Amino acid sequence: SMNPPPPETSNPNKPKRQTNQLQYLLRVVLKTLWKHQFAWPFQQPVDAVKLNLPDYYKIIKTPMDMGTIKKRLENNYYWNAQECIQDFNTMFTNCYIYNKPGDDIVLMAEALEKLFLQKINELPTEE
Amino acid sequence: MNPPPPETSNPNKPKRQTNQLQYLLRVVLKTLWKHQFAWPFQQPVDAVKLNLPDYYKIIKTPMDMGTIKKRLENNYYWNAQECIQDFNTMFTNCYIYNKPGDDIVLMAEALEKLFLQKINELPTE
Amino acid sequence: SLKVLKKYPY
Predict the structure, then answer these.
(1) Distance (Å, whole) CA B29 – CA B115
(2) Of the candidates B52, B53, B103, which has its C-beta nearest C5's C-beta?
(3) N or C: which end of chain A has fewer CB within 10 A?
(4) Is the CATH number 1.20.920.10 carried by domain B18-122?
(5) Where are the residues marked Acetylated histone binding as a site (chain B)?
(6) Could you say which architecture CATH assigns to the domain A19-123?
(7) Residue of chain C whose Cα is closest to the Cα of B42
């Protein structure tokens, strides 16, 4: 099985804006999660070829990863902070769906999600 | 904790280079390194990072291609057979530690098949 | 403890 094309990170037809919440999601939230000891599996699209996961893209219909999210933020792809938050949530829930409770990789995703939620609790009000 | 990585230099050996050792570096190590399944074998097993607290309880003779590369570069081996033994140790460790038929084992098996092809073509001394 | 290729760094 081939890998799918990665999720879109740029679309020049979409209107663009910068907000303080989107800036916080890049400079604080993404940065903090990126540097976490357990971030490595979540830093790029799951490479089902390299990792021999013939069923991954049968099971996970909406793939998402922090590499994509990073590019989306750097590209101003997101209009709403909530789109970005949804992408993080999709990443975590995909890991929970594909894997099983108490797999090490699930514990890694849980540690990143706990940190994520702590940083989102300090999301500034839209200026 | 991980152990220190295997020794790769021994200043109390004199230099002997041979066509068989040169072949082991320039052909055997090079070709295995570039194989699509080499990546887990290119450095020592990081039991700490990988959460394998029993790895070095079970494996007392660890070996990896990064170490073999360095040994060949530092003329650590006197003969080809010492180097061949290191490759074989690397494969057997994987077979000992991991469950038969797991991905990592299948990767090792593919590398070993390639290794045995290349050693069949070892030049004469 | 088990090697899981999906969480193997590269």
Answers:
(1) 9
(2) B103
(3) C
(4) yes
(5) 98
(6) Up-down Bundle (1.20)
(7) C10
Domain layout of chain B by residue ranges: 18-122
Residue keyed to tokens 């070993």: B112
How many angstroms separate the CA of residue A46 from the nearest CA in chain C?
8
E runs forming strands in B10-91: none
The residue type of A85 is I
CA distances from B98 to A83, A107, B44, B84, C1 (A): 42, 22, 15, 22, 10
CA atoms in the 13 A half-sphere facing the CB of A37: 6
For residue A92, what are its two tokens? Answer: 């975590």
The verdict on whether residue C6 carries a ligand-binding annotation is no
- Residue for token pair 């919440």: A21
* Mutate: best of C2, C3, C6, partner B, most B CBs <10 A: C3
Please answer yes or no on whether C6 and A105 come within 8 Å at the CB atom. yes
Distances, alpha carbon B18 to alpha carbons A29, B12, B15, in Å? 56, 19, 10
CA dihedral A35, B4, B58, B97 (to 10 degrees): 50
Q: What is the resolution of this structure in A?
A: 1.5
Are B40 and C1 a contacting pair at CB < 8 A? no
- CB-CB contact of B118 with B30 (8 Å): no
CA B89/CA B68 separation, integer angstroms: 11
Experimental method: X-ray
